[PDB]
Design an enzyme around this catalytic site. Sequence first.
Site, PDB file in Angstrom:
ATOM      1  N   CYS B 149     -29.559 -30.121 -19.005  1.00 16.74           N
ATOM      2  CA  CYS B 149     -29.423 -29.444 -20.288  1.00 16.74           C
ATOM      3  C   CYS B 149     -30.773 -28.986 -20.858  1.00 16.74           C
ATOM      4  O   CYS B 149     -30.918 -27.831 -21.270  1.00 16.74           O
ATOM      5  CB  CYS B 149     -28.692 -30.346 -21.274  1.00 16.74           C
ATOM      6  SG  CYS B 149     -28.211 -29.520 -22.793  1.00 16.74           S
ATOM      7  N   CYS B 154     -28.217 -26.001 -21.017  1.00 16.11           N
ATOM      8  CA  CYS B 154     -27.843 -25.592 -22.379  1.00 16.11           C
ATOM      9  C   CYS B 154     -28.992 -24.972 -23.177  1.00 16.11           C
ATOM     10  O   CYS B 154     -28.816 -23.937 -23.822  1.00 16.11           O
ATOM     11  CB  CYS B 154     -27.283 -26.777 -23.179  1.00 16.11           C
ATOM     12  SG  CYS B 154     -26.576 -28.143 -22.223  1.00 16.11           S
ATOM     13  N   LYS B 157     -30.527 -21.617 -21.582  1.00 12.54           N
ATOM     14  CA  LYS B 157     -29.381 -20.695 -21.604  1.00 12.54           C
ATOM     15  C   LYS B 157     -29.166 -20.132 -23.009  1.00 12.54           C
ATOM     16  O   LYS B 157     -29.052 -18.914 -23.180  1.00 12.54           O
ATOM     17  CB  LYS B 157     -28.103 -21.395 -21.094  1.00 12.54           C
ATOM     18  CG  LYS B 157     -26.790 -20.582 -21.149  1.00 12.54           C
ATOM     19  CD  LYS B 157     -26.058 -20.626 -22.512  1.00 12.54           C
ATOM     20  CE  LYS B 157     -25.601 -22.029 -22.930  1.00 12.54           C
ATOM     21  NZ  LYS B 157     -24.491 -22.588 -22.102  1.00 12.54           N
ATOM     22  N   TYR B 291     -18.370 -20.271 -16.229  1.00 12.55           N
ATOM     23  CA  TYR B 291     -19.037 -20.012 -17.506  1.00 12.55           C
ATOM     24  C   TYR B 291     -20.534 -19.773 -17.300  1.00 12.55           C
ATOM     25  O   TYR B 291     -21.126 -18.955 -17.998  1.00 12.55           O
ATOM     26  CB  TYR B 291     -18.752 -21.106 -18.551  1.00 12.55           C
ATOM     27  CG  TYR B 291     -19.519 -22.399 -18.392  1.00 12.55           C
ATOM     28  CD1 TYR B 291     -18.950 -23.497 -17.747  1.00 12.55           C
ATOM     29  CD2 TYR B 291     -20.806 -22.534 -18.914  1.00 12.55           C
ATOM     30  CE1 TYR B 291     -19.656 -24.696 -17.609  1.00 12.55           C
ATOM     31  CE2 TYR B 291     -21.520 -23.720 -18.779  1.00 12.55           C
ATOM     32  CZ  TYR B 291     -20.938 -24.797 -18.130  1.00 12.55           C
ATOM     33  OH  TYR B 291     -21.647 -25.968 -18.006  1.00 12.55           O
ATOM     34  N   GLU B 295     -22.274 -16.370 -18.564  1.00 16.08           N
ATOM     35  CA  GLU B 295     -23.349 -16.543 -19.546  1.00 16.08           C
ATOM     36  C   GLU B 295     -24.649 -15.885 -19.083  1.00 16.08           C
ATOM     37  O   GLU B 295     -25.287 -15.157 -19.846  1.00 16.08           O
ATOM     38  CB  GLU B 295     -23.576 -18.024 -19.863  1.00 16.08           C
ATOM     39  CG  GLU B 295     -22.523 -18.622 -20.810  1.00 16.08           C
ATOM     40  CD  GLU B 295     -22.672 -20.126 -21.000  1.00 16.08           C
ATOM     41  OE1 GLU B 295     -23.488 -20.751 -20.284  1.00 16.08           O
ATOM     42  OE2 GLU B 295     -21.965 -20.690 -21.868  1.00 16.08           O
ATOM     43  N   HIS B 566     -15.049 -17.456 -48.217  1.00 15.21           N
ATOM     44  CA  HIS B 566     -15.156 -16.005 -48.080  1.00 15.21           C
ATOM     45  C   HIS B 566     -16.552 -15.527 -48.484  1.00 15.21           C
ATOM     46  O   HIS B 566     -17.117 -16.041 -49.447  1.00 15.21           O
ATOM     47  CB  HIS B 566     -14.089 -15.354 -48.964  1.00 15.21           C
ATOM     48  CG  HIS B 566     -14.017 -13.865 -48.849  1.00 15.21           C
ATOM     49  ND1 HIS B 566     -13.504 -13.227 -47.740  1.00 15.21           N
ATOM     50  CD2 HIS B 566     -14.369 -12.888 -49.718  1.00 15.21           C
ATOM     51  CE1 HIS B 566     -13.552 -11.920 -47.927  1.00 15.21           C
ATOM     52  NE2 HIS B 566     -14.073 -11.687 -49.119  1.00 15.21           N
ATOM     53  N   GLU B 571     -12.645 -18.481 -41.874  1.00 12.53           N
ATOM     54  CA  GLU B 571     -11.530 -18.488 -42.841  1.00 12.53           C
ATOM     55  C   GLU B 571     -10.212 -17.926 -42.297  1.00 12.53           C
ATOM     56  O   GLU B 571      -9.139 -18.272 -42.794  1.00 12.53           O
ATOM     57  CB  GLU B 571     -11.914 -17.787 -44.155  1.00 12.53           C
ATOM     58  CG  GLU B 571     -12.091 -16.273 -44.055  1.00 12.53           C
ATOM     59  CD  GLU B 571     -12.374 -15.606 -45.396  1.00 12.53           C
ATOM     60  OE1 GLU B 571     -11.712 -15.943 -46.405  1.00 12.53           O
ATOM     61  OE2 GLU B 571     -13.255 -14.725 -45.437  1.00 12.53           O
TER      62      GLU B 571
END
Lengths: 588, 588
Positions: B149, B154, B157, B291, B295, B566, B571
């Site tokens: 990672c 991670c 990336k 993925y 990515e 909002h 939302e």
Amino acid sequence: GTSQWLRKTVDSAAVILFSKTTCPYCKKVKDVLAEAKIKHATIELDQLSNGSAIQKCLASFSKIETVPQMFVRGKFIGDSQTVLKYYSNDELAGIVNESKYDYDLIVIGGGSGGLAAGKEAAKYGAKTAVLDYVEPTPIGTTWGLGGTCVNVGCIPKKLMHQAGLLSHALEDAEHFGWSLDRSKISHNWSTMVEGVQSHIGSLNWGYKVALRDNQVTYLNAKGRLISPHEVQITDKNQKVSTITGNKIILATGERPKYPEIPGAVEYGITSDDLFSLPYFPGKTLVIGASYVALECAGFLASLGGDVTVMVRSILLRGFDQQMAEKVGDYMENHGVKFAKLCVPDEIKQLKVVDTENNKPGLLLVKGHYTDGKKFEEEFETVIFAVGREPQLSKVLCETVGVKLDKNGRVVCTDDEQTTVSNVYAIGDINAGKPQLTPVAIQAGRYLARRLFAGATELTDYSNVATTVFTPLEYGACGLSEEDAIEKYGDKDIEVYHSNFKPLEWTVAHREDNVCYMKLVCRKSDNMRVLGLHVLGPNAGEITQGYAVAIKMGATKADFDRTIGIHPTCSETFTTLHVTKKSGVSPIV
Amino acid sequence: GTSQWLRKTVDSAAVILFSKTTCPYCKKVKDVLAEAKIKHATIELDQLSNGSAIQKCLASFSKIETVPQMFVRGKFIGDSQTVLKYYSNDELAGIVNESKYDYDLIVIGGGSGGLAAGKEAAKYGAKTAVLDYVEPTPIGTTWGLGGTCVNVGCIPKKLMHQAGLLSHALEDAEHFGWSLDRSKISHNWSTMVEGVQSHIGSLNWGYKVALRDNQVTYLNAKGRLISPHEVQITDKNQKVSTITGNKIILATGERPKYPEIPGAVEYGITSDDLFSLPYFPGKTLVIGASYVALECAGFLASLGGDVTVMVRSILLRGFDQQMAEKVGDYMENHGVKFAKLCVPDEIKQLKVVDTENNKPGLLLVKGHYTDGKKFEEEFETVIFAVGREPQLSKVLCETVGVKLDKNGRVVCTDDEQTTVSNVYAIGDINAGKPQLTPVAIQAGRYLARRLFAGATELTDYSNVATTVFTPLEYGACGLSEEDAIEKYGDKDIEVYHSNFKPLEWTVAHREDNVCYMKLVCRKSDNMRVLGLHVLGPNAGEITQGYAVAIKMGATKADFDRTIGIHPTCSETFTTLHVTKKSGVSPIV
Ligand SMILES: Cc1cc2nc3c(=O)[nH]c(=O)nc-3n(C[C@H](O)[C@H](O)[C@H](O)COP(=O)(O)OP(=O)(O)OC[C@H]3O[C@@H](n4cnc5c(N)ncnc54)[C@H](O)[C@@H]3O)c2cc1C
Ligand SMILES: Cc1cc2nc3c(=O)[nH]c(=O)nc-3n(C[C@H](O)[C@H](O)[C@H](O)COP(=O)(O)OP(=O)(O)OC[C@H]3O[C@@H](n4cnc5c(N)ncnc54)[C@H](O)[C@@H]3O)c2cc1C
Ligand SMILES: N[C@@H](CCC(=O)N[C@@H](CS)C(=O)NCC(=O)O)C(=O)O
Ligand SMILES: N[C@@H](CCC(=O)N[C@@H](CS)C(=O)NCC(=O)O)C(=O)O
Ligand SMILES: [Ca+2]
Ligand SMILES: [Ca+2]
């Protein structure tokens, strides 16, 4: 409570069908109504636990217990054979149109709450009218349908906020390998305003089209409630008329306040004017310390503006004060100047706005600090953000009998009912309620469903999440730390907290230990989360999901058991361990 | 279960104190241990409901029922007077140091899981060693402490993802009023890599400092478990030694796979090489549809690269396939080329990487489509992203007795125990578990607490949220639509969905009806939310909060009652109403 529910439902619904999903006669009526273009509410009794009881109770209204049963405005009109009789005789349209009043619902106010209520009611066959009028600001600014949020609120505010955030994206870009000459980059206020206003225009038009498509009568007119069922209307040509409605929804909202000082109304502007301002504000003074004041000051500074904020006492009164200080500290560290413990006395004009070159004028602001020292500085623009006020003397005749509080807001029941029983109030004018767009929308939709579709669900105004869109955003849901302590005592409150740093800020060389979050918890209630607070980018996106968990009664344990998504800012909520009582530093 | 819990706790804890918060003798021992710099776990019996039962059970280990009671590695060492006796006689350090083994815990692997477990154990006085070694990639790439990672996963990336997102921020900037000449803007790969690698370097150093500060012995060495308690170590000088440990944690992770084709190992690269690549990749082929593949392809295209993705069959196998298609469609619409139903046969070198000008070489890729047509195209860089694999033959002697599955991963109990009872496995090598950083960290921390602090809490691997950081991000928590239907039947599944548009995309003139969300619900279980899915910007930030609500058993009603913030994208989850069964379009 079955009898009470049915009595209310029959009395209030405009056009309603009591049905069963398995009944072929119910389908026949549904098909007839759909072909005749008759909109209506439907209650499927076989989908309710008390459905059998409702059938028995319906006999008190219709003398029958079978399905279907159709009602129009409080009266049983027939079973399946009877409805088809009206249809075959060209009588059905007239019957479902018979009314004591012009409309089943008149909505006064075409903003967030009003449009939501009006559109929702029309769905169930309520004959609906929506009235909207925008009284111009002192300098003459006006706008189209959609109310405060669409035209002079959430929408343009967030778009200008984004324009401001893109300034810092331009800075970050270099550190991420992008080759650009920042010394040759500038911002054009008017180009931004034109883009923002083009989108607002599409929303104005969008809402007009939506009302047309929902068969809602839209009147661009000033409404005045003169009796419980009578609304006086004044059109664009100053022609005065009266329309009648069974139920009335007041949703007229608020407008900016001005301080009572010489020059304020003549030379100052407010948020109402800012979002369509034809000239760049230039060197700006914001008078106020509300979320509006700080949001506006914030984006103006990011767009390269020389910005000062005049603060009477504290920032964001009502909000968690630790968080408020952090919001202000970030702004101050990034060039927003604060005139602390300072009040304005007068505004004098030094130059008029250039209306052909679209350039600001110039003003002299005179004031004083609490220490007695004089404030005297020149600003190109002065913006007042000192709160907002209802204006129901422009909407409501005193003889109608709608009770207002000391602040001029409508005193309502927990189902939005005023002291006049057919009259309801929603949105910003509803006394004691959170003044937010989604609240107004939920209130309006839920009310319309109760009135016209037999719904029981009330709007829940508790633990409504918020986000202040300052340069560094602040999201919250639930109680401030101080309110939680006041309510339950310091000994029953535990606060978990941590600083964090967005991964995006590392390569960009932005601040350590500035972004911050905390959970305010109640020790005696299994560490129940009473309040959640986060300072950081996209704080609204971070906060929203947690509002569902808090609604469900989340505890610290629930946060602990949930696994983080990496790399995100939000994951920091899943691994909090440092308490305030321990005295351990929250730094990382 | 009190007796069983205490038996396990006493047996496993390195240094533990049974205490009461109100006892002055307990405070005396705590102060002595703190002054002597002796770290330990503490169990406060007055804070537990079964505390009185624990006191009685302790007599089976100590012959006393009073507090404090101190234990070292399975043995009662004394009450308050006895501990102070050891202290006054200079005996305490020796006693709390006595062990059958060199360490209480040896962690093999210094990645996400390993570092988390090692640091957490040391907190409770477990004598801990962390071993980390990074075997170089075929082209010679290596890196520092922190695992996949931190170095090749991670972190880099997401940083390169951000560099890519800033490309589109530059585009958006113009529409928001910013004046810049985009025709004169370019990206410099190496400048980006240097910034990314500088941050990775600070993390490498940060973890080393953290281990030092936690009194964890860090050995940059290759570890091999040769018996349940013996670990063979090889240092940088190729010197071989043996160390012993009571408990062993296997946390050695995985490495990229290569396809068995000529030229693959010689000329291709993987994610291991990409994040420190000294030259710009240029025209790139990504072989794979994971993925990782998408990515990497994604950010390369956003940085202006000519990018092709070779796909054997489908995208993101294992993920919701509707969402996977939408992810791919966005990428294709924004210039990522896809070679569909295509497999590689060989890679031939046409040019060697320029090591002085830092420029890529050139490769010829030969392949074939399922239709029989030949694939033959030149690429400057070829990246393999065809999955990852454990390499436990490099870590584990077969005679030890640790059971592996058909894929070479460790078969574990629900408390991470292997078939060798003192040996545990966490992170990517734990068979059947979600392969994510926060999962490895939670597993390691929770395990260390169970072993050394008497904790009972197991890691919950269910409904772990994820985010794929493609150009348009995809966040999910819970079941895919297809898995929910397979599990419960189509008749018991309801899907609520909507398109949405970020407010930021309006002025920027980006797509309507591309961003998308859905809730997969179970009709018979009060519309329980089984799966949440969102395609849009900052999808990780959106998703995270909802993962807590889902953990708590959120229903559609819980989402409905919660009020939106909002303006946000998140939302939209609070007002979903369109079902898939209704056949109504999700467009807005
Ligand atoms: C600068 C600013 C930023 C904001 N940002 C946010 C935010 O980010 N998020 C959020 O949730 N909320 C935000 N708000 C608050 C939000 O705008 C309001 O809560 C919401 O608009 C209230 O809607 P409403 O239906 O109650 O009234 P309004 O939206 O104000 O609509 C009322 C309408 O009725 C009209 N009217 C008045 N009298 C009459 C009459 N006699 N006859 C006919 N029509 C009449 C008014 O002109 C207006 O058009 C912001 C507000 C401001 C001022
Ligand atoms: C390109 C990519 C992107 C990713 N992005 C994300 C993401 O965005 N979010 C997310 O949650 N997860 C992501 N992951 C997955 C995540 O990286 C892993 O789940 C996590 O790193 C697993 O950690 P671990 O402790 O199990 O093993 P690792 O982090 O791989 O650490 C194991 C360490 O042990 C070392 N080792 C191996 N053998 C020995 C030995 N014999 N002796 C001593 N040391 C040894 C290895 O060299 C390595 O340093 C990504 C992975 C990749 C490849
Ligand atoms: N004559 C009635 C027909 C009523 C009828 O046959 N409906 C059935 C359902 S298919 C019914 O209400 N049965 C009793 C019940 O459902 O409880 C009409 O025209 O509406
Ligand atoms: N002689 C013991 C003292 C034990 C003692 O007096 N502790 C009290 C608490 S202050 C106790 O365990 N009382 C019984 C109980 O707590 O149940 C020692 O040195 O540790
Ligand atoms: Ca957690
Ligand atoms: Ca809701």
